[PDB]
Amino acid sequence: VLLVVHATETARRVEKVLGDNDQHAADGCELVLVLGGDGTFLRAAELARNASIPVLGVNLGRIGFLAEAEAEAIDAVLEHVVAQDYRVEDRLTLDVVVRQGGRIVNRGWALNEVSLEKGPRLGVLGVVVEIDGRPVSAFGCDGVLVSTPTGSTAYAFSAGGPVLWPDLEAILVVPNNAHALFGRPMVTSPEATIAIEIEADGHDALVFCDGRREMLIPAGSRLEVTRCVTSVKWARLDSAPFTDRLVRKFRLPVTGWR
Amino acid sequence: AHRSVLLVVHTRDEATETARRVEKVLGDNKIALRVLSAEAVDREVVDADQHAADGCELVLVLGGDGTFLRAAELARNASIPVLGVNLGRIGFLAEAEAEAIDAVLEHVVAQDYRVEDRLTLDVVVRQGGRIVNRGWALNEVSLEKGPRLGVLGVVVEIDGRPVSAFGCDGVLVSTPTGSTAYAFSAGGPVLWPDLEAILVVPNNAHALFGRPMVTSPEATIAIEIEADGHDALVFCDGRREMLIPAGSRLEVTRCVTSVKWARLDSAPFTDRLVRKFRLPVTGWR
Amino acid sequence: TAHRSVLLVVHTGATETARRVEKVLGDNKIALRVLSAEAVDRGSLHLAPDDMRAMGVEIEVVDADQHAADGCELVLVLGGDGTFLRAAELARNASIPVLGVNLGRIGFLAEAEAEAIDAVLEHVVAQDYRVEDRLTLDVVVRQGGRIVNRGWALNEVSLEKGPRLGVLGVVVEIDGRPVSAFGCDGVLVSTPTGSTAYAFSAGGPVLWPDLEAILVVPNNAHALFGRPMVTSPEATIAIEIEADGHDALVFCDGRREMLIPAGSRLEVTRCVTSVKWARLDSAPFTDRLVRKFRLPVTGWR
Amino acid sequence: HRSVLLVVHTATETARRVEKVLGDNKIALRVLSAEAVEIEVVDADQHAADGCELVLVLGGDGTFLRAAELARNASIPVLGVNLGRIGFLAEAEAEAIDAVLEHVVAQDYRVEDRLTLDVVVRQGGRIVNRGWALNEVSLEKGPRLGVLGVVVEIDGRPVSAFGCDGVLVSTPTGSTAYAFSAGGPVLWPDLEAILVVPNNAHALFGRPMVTSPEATIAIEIEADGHDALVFCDGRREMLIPAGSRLEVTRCVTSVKWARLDSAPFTDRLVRKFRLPVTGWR
């Protein structure tokens, strides 16, 4: 067990029960356990990625979407860490390439969001969004989010997208502040290719993945996002349903229900 | 025994050039046309009343989107594929336009076309535990306020836990295919026709969260009609109506009986979306 | 001859705070009006002059029949938003202030709740409230060139599609020129006051009550642009209902209904005579919004 | 002596005809390039129009804004003529340059005050920066990543607190621009109101508010986050200290807008957005 953390000192009760029984290639292990927030989980996934092992997440501070257990139950988790018994479920991951003159110049991955974004703070990004080899819209905007159903709850939600339950397989596209009549979010089979075409004449742009790995989009290039061949592995427990998490998260009213 | 095709036509246009061309081709090939009596009453050729016209291999539809949907009600019955040709306006469901009629007919005859099972929804109105009506939809199930003024108390439940209680004009539960229709009007996202998912769009919900939700094809969406209020209504495909009683419960699920759609060498969904909505697409690659 | 009159309006069936009106309104030599309906049933549970003089209250001038009838100082609705809208109804004829006390649910238009009717009534007596003109709308229906029905609204004018199925085709024109043609469920021409109601539901932004503007929110427009539009107070919204389609209906303030024939034309304009709203030291519109939508507000000064 | 500042984007046929007619008529011409005695070429300077009777602009909306800046600083009218593109802000299009010039010479055009927003950055009781806007104050996330903490307040009373990319406070003229991009409703430019539009707010109520033009819109910047930016009319930047309080009110002296016999807004709107309009009347 790699253990990534951070009142965050239930950190010790983890090392207690585990011994009872440098970040980059820091994988080597069989499981990653994270004690922290949604952001921390995204961080651990980074690490679990390269030597494809499961991730598990324990919610210390706030209330998020990814962690599979509360803090005040860190023991009932350890039992399962020992027991090796949890179902590990593969989850849709996005693959992104950046291509100039037909040639792949940069490449990345996300489990929440590929967020192509304006370069200069002032002005707009000309972009042509493309779906399965055909164009759907040209407009200027702050960027385009290409999102996973897990990620459909993060930034893409802020950009105004719909909420996708986490066990669905789809790719979500939410144009981010598009100056245009149809800036409607679009949803697409997991088999599809979203390509966005940065304006040749304009300035360079950025992409961000899981709000943490940055790339540089040269003017005139092409982002291709498709479903990735090697998913992220998620530990799963007797956690609450996504539905319950959405409800808690957003204090959604639910009185009157049978 | 013989082959037969059922032809469903909008009714008068260059809808007659096309109909006659259909009567011609199948005639030449010993395939019997069959038409709907009302349609044949403003002028081999059998003539059926409109309930279950089957015995046929294909339902050929000449007209537009709303027409396709009538045709599919007819096809659902004997579960036979439907194929649509556009006459006047621009739609999402036809696989060709009249100006390519002759070519379709080569396919109608050869029967060489692909037949996809497009996702279909299954609805049950349940009261007191006991199912009191059922329906199905290929586009949308539209739960809607009964009386014109007032609001409809609703709780939306997804996979067995409640997601939201509000008042609204209604709730749409939509097929990817139906995301283009009423759901779009009500604020929904466009979903691509091949995706298998389920879309929920609260209709005119007076409340903060009325986001579209999208769900995998295996989910159950249930909507509980406020007991004390008035009876609601559900509409499937803007054609079949069920009276939802106050206090009942509506479950929508993926149907096991897909509508068979007869597929051709046609435009991608993207292109059709662009055409319909005049989407600005200059500058592309 | 010379005299002080005050119209009670109530939601019949805490309606006895209504007699607390009838008490206090008497010892002050006021009025207490009531309508036909208001005094053929409850609300006037104590309907009798055998109670209205035993109270020392030259009170109950039931005389008043509903609508185009009366010359008072104020209208005092106890009831809800529903009812304030009723009262406003009448009052608009007489062109006089409306003051609403809230029995049940929290409303946007009520100046107080019943646990206060004591103080409320004290301010009524003293005439020491504030009056304030809220924007009111005027709607006409015009067919074959000429007016063929007319209406008015304080909240919304809701043009709604007639038959249950299919869709209503509509061209929306603002100050003379067309702005969007689409099929929809309808179109809301709303007041700032009314942007809280159906218009909100239908996606409109929230407008502060004092603002002077007109809000247009296409209801479920099947179109890329069905944004809400906000227009100056003196614009003219016109919606032409398509000819080949069906008739339609409009409702003003969720009550005064009008049939809108196919091919006719709706024109909404600000009305010359605003409704007048009696106003106390009450919550600003901000706090009402924060309460009725339960808005997250914290980490502030 | 009468004088006019001409702001052209740098296109020449129009520019020449202006040079021409204002010569023939004894009006001094100051030319300023927008990228940046009978005629002068003037440096880009906030005081360029300080003596002129009018600012005339050839170009689209972005240029109008640059010109408006100057006209505001010299407290005189601006007038725009469109060149290449379609805009909301010009009063006439290049082909009608002659007619326009005639009015320029004549000084017979209506000049209407148009609502302008005044913005202040206040911190600990002192006002520590300030600005104005004719389109929008755009309060924005400082760091490219992360969200910005915000509490939005109307006449002293809080209305919402959420994380966001920023908050737009917009002028009705403005409602057509970035505000529109952000989800805003469209506002007729004669209307006098202030529009608030949250920008990518991770919350259920991100709904546009529209406020009487006497309101005080304030925004309190989370004391624990990073600095934020504010941009005005897509062009005048201001650093916003963490913990401070933005305030936007209607400015006392507004921008003067020369008017003319132009298309009504409704048309402008239909023109830009290619709004479907068939079957009318």
Short mmCIF file of N, CA and C in Angstrom, two decimals, chain D residues 184-273:
data_model
loop_
_atom_site.label_atom_id
_atom_site.label_comp_id
_atom_site.label_asym_id
_atom_site.label_seq_id
_atom_site.Cartn_x
_atom_site.Cartn_y
_atom_site.Cartn_z
N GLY D 184 -26.28 34.83 -20.03
CA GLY D 184 -27.12 35.94 -19.64
C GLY D 184 -28.29 36.04 -20.57
N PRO D 185 -29.32 36.80 -20.16
CA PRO D 185 -30.47 37.17 -21.00
C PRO D 185 -30.18 38.39 -21.86
N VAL D 186 -30.94 38.65 -22.90
CA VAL D 186 -30.59 39.82 -23.71
C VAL D 186 -31.43 41.04 -23.37
N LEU D 187 -30.75 42.17 -23.20
CA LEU D 187 -31.34 43.41 -22.68
C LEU D 187 -31.33 44.53 -23.72
N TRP D 188 -32.44 45.25 -23.86
CA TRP D 188 -32.53 46.28 -24.87
C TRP D 188 -31.73 47.49 -24.41
N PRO D 189 -30.90 48.09 -25.27
CA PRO D 189 -29.89 49.06 -24.79
C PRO D 189 -30.48 50.32 -24.18
N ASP D 190 -31.75 50.63 -24.49
CA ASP D 190 -32.38 51.80 -23.90
C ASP D 190 -32.80 51.52 -22.45
N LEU D 191 -33.01 50.27 -22.13
CA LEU D 191 -33.30 49.93 -20.76
C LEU D 191 -32.24 50.46 -19.78
N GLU D 192 -32.69 50.93 -18.62
CA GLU D 192 -31.79 51.29 -17.54
C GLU D 192 -31.96 50.34 -16.36
N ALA D 193 -30.98 49.44 -16.23
CA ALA D 193 -30.95 48.35 -15.26
C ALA D 193 -29.50 47.84 -15.13
N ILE D 194 -29.19 47.01 -14.14
CA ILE D 194 -27.86 46.45 -14.06
C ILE D 194 -28.06 44.97 -14.02
N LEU D 195 -27.20 44.24 -14.72
CA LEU D 195 -27.37 42.84 -14.91
C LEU D 195 -26.28 42.07 -14.18
N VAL D 196 -26.62 41.09 -13.36
CA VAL D 196 -25.53 40.35 -12.72
C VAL D 196 -25.51 38.94 -13.24
N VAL D 197 -24.36 38.44 -13.64
CA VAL D 197 -24.36 37.12 -14.20
C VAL D 197 -23.13 36.41 -13.71
N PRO D 198 -23.37 35.40 -12.87
CA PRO D 198 -22.33 34.55 -12.35
C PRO D 198 -21.65 33.82 -13.49
N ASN D 199 -20.38 33.59 -13.32
CA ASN D 199 -19.64 33.02 -14.38
C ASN D 199 -19.14 31.66 -13.98
N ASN D 200 -19.78 30.63 -14.53
CA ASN D 200 -19.41 29.26 -14.27
C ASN D 200 -19.39 28.99 -12.80
N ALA D 201 -20.52 29.18 -12.18
CA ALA D 201 -20.63 29.06 -10.74
C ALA D 201 -20.99 27.64 -10.40
N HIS D 202 -20.17 26.98 -9.60
CA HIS D 202 -20.46 25.62 -9.19
C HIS D 202 -21.59 25.57 -8.13
N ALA D 203 -22.81 25.91 -8.52
CA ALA D 203 -23.92 26.03 -7.58
C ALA D 203 -25.22 25.83 -8.33
N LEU D 204 -26.31 25.55 -7.62
CA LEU D 204 -27.60 25.37 -8.24
C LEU D 204 -28.22 26.72 -8.72
N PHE D 205 -28.11 27.81 -7.91
CA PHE D 205 -28.55 29.15 -8.32
C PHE D 205 -27.38 29.90 -8.92
N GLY D 206 -27.15 29.73 -10.21
CA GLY D 206 -26.29 30.64 -10.94
C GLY D 206 -27.12 31.63 -11.76
N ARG D 207 -28.36 31.87 -11.36
CA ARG D 207 -29.26 32.59 -12.21
C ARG D 207 -29.04 34.08 -12.28
N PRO D 208 -29.06 34.60 -13.52
CA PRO D 208 -28.88 36.01 -13.79
C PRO D 208 -29.83 36.81 -12.95
N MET D 209 -29.36 37.91 -12.37
CA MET D 209 -30.26 38.83 -11.68
C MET D 209 -30.27 40.12 -12.46
N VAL D 210 -31.40 40.80 -12.50
CA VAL D 210 -31.45 42.13 -13.07
C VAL D 210 -32.04 43.09 -12.07
N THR D 211 -31.35 44.20 -11.91
CA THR D 211 -31.47 45.06 -10.75
C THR D 211 -31.84 46.47 -11.16
N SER D 212 -32.58 47.19 -10.34
CA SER D 212 -32.88 48.58 -10.69
C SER D 212 -31.57 49.34 -10.81
N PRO D 213 -31.52 50.45 -11.54
CA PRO D 213 -30.24 51.08 -11.86
C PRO D 213 -29.72 51.96 -10.73
N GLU D 214 -30.40 51.89 -9.60
CA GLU D 214 -29.99 52.53 -8.38
C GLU D 214 -29.38 51.57 -7.40
N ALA D 215 -29.15 50.32 -7.78
CA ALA D 215 -28.70 49.33 -6.80
C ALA D 215 -27.21 49.41 -6.55
N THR D 216 -26.74 48.85 -5.45
CA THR D 216 -25.30 48.74 -5.27
C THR D 216 -24.94 47.28 -5.25
N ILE D 217 -24.27 46.81 -6.31
CA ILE D 217 -23.90 45.42 -6.43
C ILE D 217 -22.53 45.34 -5.80
N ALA D 218 -22.32 44.49 -4.80
CA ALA D 218 -21.01 44.36 -4.26
C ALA D 218 -20.67 42.91 -4.33
N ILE D 219 -19.37 42.63 -4.41
CA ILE D 219 -18.85 41.30 -4.42
C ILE D 219 -17.67 41.20 -3.49
N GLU D 220 -17.77 40.35 -2.49
CA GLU D 220 -16.72 40.12 -1.51
C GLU D 220 -15.88 38.93 -1.89
N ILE D 221 -14.60 39.19 -2.05
CA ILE D 221 -13.61 38.22 -2.51
C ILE D 221 -13.10 37.45 -1.32
N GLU D 222 -13.29 36.14 -1.32
CA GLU D 222 -12.83 35.30 -0.24
C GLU D 222 -11.50 35.81 0.27
N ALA D 223 -11.42 36.13 1.57
CA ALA D 223 -10.16 36.53 2.21
C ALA D 223 -9.02 35.51 2.21
N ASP D 224 -9.31 34.24 1.95
CA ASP D 224 -8.30 33.17 2.02
C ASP D 224 -7.77 32.65 0.71
N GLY D 225 -8.36 33.10 -0.37
CA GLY D 225 -7.90 32.68 -1.68
C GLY D 225 -6.85 33.61 -2.23
N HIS D 226 -6.72 33.57 -3.55
CA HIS D 226 -5.70 34.34 -4.23
C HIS D 226 -6.32 35.61 -4.73
N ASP D 227 -5.51 36.43 -5.37
CA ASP D 227 -6.00 37.68 -5.89
C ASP D 227 -6.89 37.38 -7.08
N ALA D 228 -7.79 38.28 -7.40
CA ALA D 228 -8.59 38.10 -8.57
C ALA D 228 -8.35 39.25 -9.51
N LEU D 229 -8.85 39.10 -10.73
CA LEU D 229 -8.76 40.13 -11.72
C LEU D 229 -10.13 40.68 -11.94
N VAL D 230 -10.18 41.92 -12.39
CA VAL D 230 -11.36 42.54 -12.93
C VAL D 230 -10.96 43.12 -14.27
N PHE D 231 -11.81 43.01 -15.27
CA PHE D 231 -11.54 43.56 -16.59
C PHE D 231 -12.70 44.43 -16.95
N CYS D 232 -12.46 45.53 -17.62
CA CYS D 232 -13.53 46.39 -17.93
C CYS D 232 -13.60 46.59 -19.44
N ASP D 233 -14.79 46.38 -20.00
CA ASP D 233 -15.00 46.52 -21.41
C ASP D 233 -13.96 45.74 -22.21
N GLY D 234 -13.61 44.56 -21.71
CA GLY D 234 -12.66 43.70 -22.35
C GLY D 234 -11.31 44.33 -22.53
N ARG D 235 -10.92 45.23 -21.64
CA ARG D 235 -9.71 46.01 -21.89
C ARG D 235 -9.07 46.82 -20.78
N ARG D 236 -9.70 47.09 -19.65
CA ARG D 236 -8.96 47.84 -18.65
C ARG D 236 -8.87 46.98 -17.42
N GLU D 237 -7.67 46.51 -17.08
CA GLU D 237 -7.51 45.49 -16.06
C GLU D 237 -7.31 46.12 -14.70
N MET D 238 -7.46 45.37 -13.62
CA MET D 238 -7.33 45.91 -12.28
C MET D 238 -7.08 44.67 -11.49
N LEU D 239 -6.15 44.72 -10.54
CA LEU D 239 -5.81 43.61 -9.65
C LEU D 239 -6.71 43.73 -8.46
N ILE D 240 -7.27 42.63 -8.00
CA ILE D 240 -8.18 42.66 -6.86
C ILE D 240 -7.57 41.85 -5.72
N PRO D 241 -7.15 42.53 -4.67
CA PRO D 241 -6.59 41.88 -3.48
C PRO D 241 -7.52 40.87 -2.86
N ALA D 242 -7.00 39.76 -2.38
CA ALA D 242 -7.84 38.80 -1.67
C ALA D 242 -8.51 39.47 -0.48
N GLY D 243 -9.79 39.28 -0.27
CA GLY D 243 -10.38 39.79 0.94
C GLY D 243 -11.10 41.11 0.75
N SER D 244 -10.95 41.68 -0.44
CA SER D 244 -11.51 42.97 -0.70
C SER D 244 -12.97 42.89 -1.19
N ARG D 245 -13.52 44.03 -1.57
CA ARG D 245 -14.91 44.09 -1.86
C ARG D 245 -15.07 44.94 -3.11
N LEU D 246 -15.59 44.36 -4.18
CA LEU D 246 -15.86 45.08 -5.40
C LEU D 246 -17.21 45.79 -5.28
N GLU D 247 -17.33 47.02 -5.75
CA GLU D 247 -18.63 47.60 -5.82
C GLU D 247 -18.91 48.25 -7.15
N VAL D 248 -20.08 47.98 -7.67
CA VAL D 248 -20.45 48.48 -8.95
C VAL D 248 -21.77 49.20 -8.78
N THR D 249 -21.81 50.45 -9.24
CA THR D 249 -23.02 51.27 -9.18
C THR D 249 -23.13 52.00 -10.48
N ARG D 250 -24.25 52.65 -10.73
CA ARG D 250 -24.36 53.44 -11.95
C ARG D 250 -23.54 54.72 -11.75
N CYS D 251 -22.67 55.00 -12.71
CA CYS D 251 -21.83 56.15 -12.63
C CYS D 251 -22.62 57.40 -12.75
N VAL D 252 -22.09 58.51 -12.21
CA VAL D 252 -22.81 59.78 -12.19
C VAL D 252 -22.77 60.40 -13.56
N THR D 253 -21.61 60.45 -14.19
CA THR D 253 -21.57 60.97 -15.53
C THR D 253 -21.38 59.82 -16.47
N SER D 254 -22.29 59.68 -17.42
CA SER D 254 -22.27 58.60 -18.37
C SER D 254 -21.59 58.98 -19.65
N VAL D 255 -21.39 57.98 -20.51
CA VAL D 255 -20.84 58.11 -21.84
C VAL D 255 -21.91 58.72 -22.70
N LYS D 256 -21.57 59.76 -23.46
CA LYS D 256 -22.47 60.33 -24.46
C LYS D 256 -22.44 59.54 -25.75
N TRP D 257 -23.63 59.17 -26.24
CA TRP D 257 -23.77 58.40 -27.47
C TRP D 257 -24.48 59.17 -28.54
N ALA D 258 -23.75 59.73 -29.47
CA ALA D 258 -24.37 60.27 -30.68
C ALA D 258 -25.33 59.29 -31.30
N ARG D 259 -26.55 59.71 -31.60
CA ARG D 259 -27.45 58.81 -32.33
C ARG D 259 -27.88 59.27 -33.71
N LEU D 260 -28.53 58.38 -34.42
CA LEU D 260 -28.82 58.60 -35.80
C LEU D 260 -30.00 57.75 -36.19
N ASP D 261 -30.40 57.88 -37.44
CA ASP D 261 -31.47 57.04 -37.95
C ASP D 261 -30.99 55.65 -38.27
N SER D 262 -30.81 54.85 -37.24
CA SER D 262 -30.22 53.56 -37.45
C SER D 262 -31.26 52.51 -37.34
N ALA D 263 -30.87 51.26 -37.59
CA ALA D 263 -31.72 50.11 -37.34
C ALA D 263 -32.04 50.04 -35.86
N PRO D 264 -33.20 49.53 -35.50
CA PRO D 264 -33.50 49.31 -34.09
C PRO D 264 -32.69 48.11 -33.60
N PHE D 265 -32.50 48.00 -32.28
CA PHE D 265 -31.77 46.89 -31.68
C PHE D 265 -32.27 45.56 -32.18
N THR D 266 -33.58 45.34 -32.09
CA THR D 266 -34.17 44.09 -32.53
C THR D 266 -33.57 43.63 -33.85
N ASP D 267 -33.34 44.54 -34.77
CA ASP D 267 -32.79 44.15 -36.05
C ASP D 267 -31.36 43.80 -35.88
N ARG D 268 -30.66 44.58 -35.07
CA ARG D 268 -29.25 44.35 -34.93
C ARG D 268 -29.12 42.93 -34.43
N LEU D 269 -29.90 42.60 -33.40
CA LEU D 269 -29.92 41.27 -32.78
C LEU D 269 -30.21 40.16 -33.76
N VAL D 270 -31.21 40.36 -34.60
CA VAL D 270 -31.58 39.37 -35.61
C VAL D 270 -30.48 39.17 -36.62
N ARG D 271 -29.81 40.28 -36.94
CA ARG D 271 -28.74 40.29 -37.91
C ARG D 271 -27.57 39.51 -37.40
N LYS D 272 -27.10 39.80 -36.20
CA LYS D 272 -25.92 39.13 -35.68
C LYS D 272 -26.11 37.65 -35.51
N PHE D 273 -27.23 37.26 -34.92
CA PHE D 273 -27.38 35.89 -34.45
C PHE D 273 -28.07 35.04 -35.46
#
